[PDB]
Write a protein that binds this ligand. Structure first.
Ligand code: PCS
Length: 290
C-alpha cells in the first residue's frame, strides 16, 4: 500500500501516489501519457520497489483525480513547471530519475531540457520529441492497415464522425495492434483510458484518439533542444509501438550516450506486454547509474 495524498502545486490540487522502500536506492518520478490519461496504466512499474526503487506516480493537471487549471494552462510548459514544483515540495533538493511514457516522454524531455540538473537519469518509453513526426509515422501505420479500417479512418475521420461504428472498429484494431497487443487488457490501463474520455485534457490537448492529433500540441517539436540533455538516458520503444522506433530513434540520435531498446512482440504499453523484461531493464539502468 503506497501513500496517497493531494498536493497543492501552482494553486491547484494534484493527486500523487508514492510507493517507496524497502532500502530505497533511488527515487523515480513518472509521467503518464495522453495528454489527459492518468498514472493508473503505469502502475505495473510498482514492481521496481522490490528492486530498491522508490516510485512516484501522479495525475498531471486536469487528469485522473487532479483538478484542472485555467484552460490557458493546458500546455506542456505548464506541465513542466507543475512537475518541478511537485518534485521540489515532496523531495526537496534531492535529485531524481524521471520516466515519461508517450506524451509523458515528451513532457519528460521538455522537463530535462530546462531542469536536467535536478535529475540523475531520464527514461523515455514510446516517447517523442516531435508531434508532427509522430503524426507522420502513425499515418504510415494507418496505411499499413487493411483497406476497410484504413478507409473508415479517412472517410469518417475527415467528417469528424469519430462516433461512427466502423471508425471505432478501426480504432480498436489499431490499438490492439499498436497500443496494447493483448486481448485481456488490465483494469489499470482501462482506467486511464476511461479517465482520458471523462476529463477534458485529452480532448483539448491531444484530440479524439491516439492517431488523431488535432489538439493544441499538434505543432510541438523540441527535437532541436533535446540535444542539450547531458544525463544518462534510456529510450525504450515497442517493436509495433504506435510511436514508432523511428520516432524513438530521433530522440536517440540527439541524446549522447543514450541507449535505445526495441522490445520485440511489444507495442506501446510495453510495461504490460513484457512486464518483467520492462521492469528488469529499467531496474538495471537505474541501479547502474546511482
Ligand atoms: N496518445 C499517446 C501518444 C501521443 C501523444 C500525443 C500526441 C500523439 C500521440 C499518449 O500521449 C498516450 Cl499513452
Amino acid at each position: 500500500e503506497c501513500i496517497e495524498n493531494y498536493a497543492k502545486v501552482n494553486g491547484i490540487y494534484i493527486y500523487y501516489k508514492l510507493c517507496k522502500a524497502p532500502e530505497e536506492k533511488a527515487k523515480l518520478m513518472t509521467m503518464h501519457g495522453g495528454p489527459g490519461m492518468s498514472h493508473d496504466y503505469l502502475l505495473s512499474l510498482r514492481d521496481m520497489t522490490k528492486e530498491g526503487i522508490t516510485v512516484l506516480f501522479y495525475d498531471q493537471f486536469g487528469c485522473g483525480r487532479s483538478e484542472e487549471p485555467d484552460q490557458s494552462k493546458f500546455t506542456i510548459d505548464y506541465g513542466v513547471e507543475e512537475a518541478e514544483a511537485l518534485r521540489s515540495k515532496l523531495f526537496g533538493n534531492e535529485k531524481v530519475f524521471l520516466m515519461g511514457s508517450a506524451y509523458g516522454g515528451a513532457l519528460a524531455l521538455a522537463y530535462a531540457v530546462k531542469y536536467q540538473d535536478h535529475l540523475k537519469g531520464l527514461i523515455v518509453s514510446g516517447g517523442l520529441s516531435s508531434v508532427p513526426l509522430t503524426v507522420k509515422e502513425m499515418n504510415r501505420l494507418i496505411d499499413e492497415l487493411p483497406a476497410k479500417y484504413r478507409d473508415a479512418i479517412k472517410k469518417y475521420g475527415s467528417s469528424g464522425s469519430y462516433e461512427n461504428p466502423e471508425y471505432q472498429e478501426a480504432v480498436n484494431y489499431f490499438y490492439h495492434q499498436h497500443l496494447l497487443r493483448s486481448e485481456d487488457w488490465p483494469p489499470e490501463v482501462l482506467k486511464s483510458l476511461e479517465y482520458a474520455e471523462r476529463r477534458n485534457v485529452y480532448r483539448i490537448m491531444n484530440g479524439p484518439n491516439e492517431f488523431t492529433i488535432t489538439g493544441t500540441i499538434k505543432d510541438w517539436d523540441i527535437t532541436d533542444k533535446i540535444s542539450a540533455i547531458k544525463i544518462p538516458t534510456l529510450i525504450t520503444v515497442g517493436e509495433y509501438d504506435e510511436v514508432t522506433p523511428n520516432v524513438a530513434r530521433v530522440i536517440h540520435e540527439k541524446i549522447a550516450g543514450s541507449e535505445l531498446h526495441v522490445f520485440r512482440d511489444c507495442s506501446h504499453l510495453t510495461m504490460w506486454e513484457d512486464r518483467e523484461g520492462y521492469n528488469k531493464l529499467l531496474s538495471d539502468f537505474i541501479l547502474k547509474h546511482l
